[PDB]
Amino acid sequence: SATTLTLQQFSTVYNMLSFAVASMLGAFAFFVMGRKIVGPKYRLALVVSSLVVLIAGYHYWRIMGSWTAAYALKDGMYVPTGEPFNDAYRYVDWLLTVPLLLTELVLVMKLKKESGSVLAKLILAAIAMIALGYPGEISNPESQAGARLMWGVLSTVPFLYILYVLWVRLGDAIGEHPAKVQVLLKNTRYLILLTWGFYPIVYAMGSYGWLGGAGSVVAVQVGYSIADVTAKALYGVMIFAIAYAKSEADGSLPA
């Protein structure tokens, strides 16, 4: 089965899940309302921003239900119920939202005829990343260690491709914009860099650790919440700030 949890551990994970739910839905309303403030050519990017956090809001709402249904209160403790709580529900979120995360960045940036081509490759790359990752995630890290490693390696190839394209296609376009736009674009890269590495690490953790003890279960689940809120809601605020800065630069800010 799984691990027994204290009220403190169960509450901590439940609260970080409720933190995630509130952050995604609140950011949704913010991005919906923020459309009126930026230039008209950057409003489609904010719509996609709202879409990302809306979907992750729905998915975290289900995860929160899944978490409370996998444990039951007995003798001042939370003991498993047999109902499964898995990380593979997250992939259903990622498969849709990660291609959308790339889309909103490209839409807020300048289109250079090939912008469609650059986006299409990244979307296809992100899809294959999650798609190849899924067989490895549902594989038993012990009884199926060969399959887990193979899919992880195959999944990492389009992953580094996305990271490479973002580094090379952003710096060549960072150095063409005002100082405020550069800082916003620069930090957005760091934001992607710091946060997106969490998911493969936890995948590699299950292969070489994690599940060992309740604290590991809490930490990983707390980590997913922090990573998702920053990679989706905070990331969407950066897209909004880039839209306002670029709208302020080309003179399209509503007056």
Structure tokens at 50: 């709202």
SS3 73: strand
Residue 118 binds a second copy, judged by CB under 8 A: no
CA–CA distance, 214 with 171 (Å, rounded to integer) = 42
CB of 78 to ligand OLC, least distance (A): 11
The residues, any chain, with a CB within 8 Å of residue 97's CB and separated by 6 or more, are 52, 55, 56, 232
Which stretch in 82-90, 164-172, 202-210, 213-221 sits in contact with a second copy by CB under 8 A? 82-90
Residue 144 binds a second copy, judged by CB under 8 A: no
The values of phi and psi at residue 71, to 5°, are: -140, 155
CB of 65 to ligand OLC, least distance (A): 21
Structure tokens at 70: 């996998």
CA–CA distance, 246 with 9 (Å, rounded to integer) = 44
Of residues 45 and 162, the one with the C-beta less far from a second copy: 45
CA angle 134, 99, 158 (to 5 degrees): 60
Burial (0-12, 13-18, 19+ Cβ within 10 Å), 250: exposed
Residue 180 binds ligand OLC, judged by CB under 6 A: yes
Q: Which residues bind ligand OLC (CB under 6 A)?
A: 6, 8-9, 12, 23, 26-27, 37, 41, 44, 95-96, 99, 103, 107, 111, 115-117, 119-120, 123-124, 127, 131, 134-135, 138, 180, 183-184, 187, 190-191, 194-195, 198, 215, 218-219, 222-223, 226-227, 229-230, 233-234, 237, 240-241, 244-245
Residues that bind ligand RET (CB under 6 A): 94, 97-98, 101, 129-130, 133, 136, 152, 155-156, 159, 196, 199-200, 203, 228, 231-232
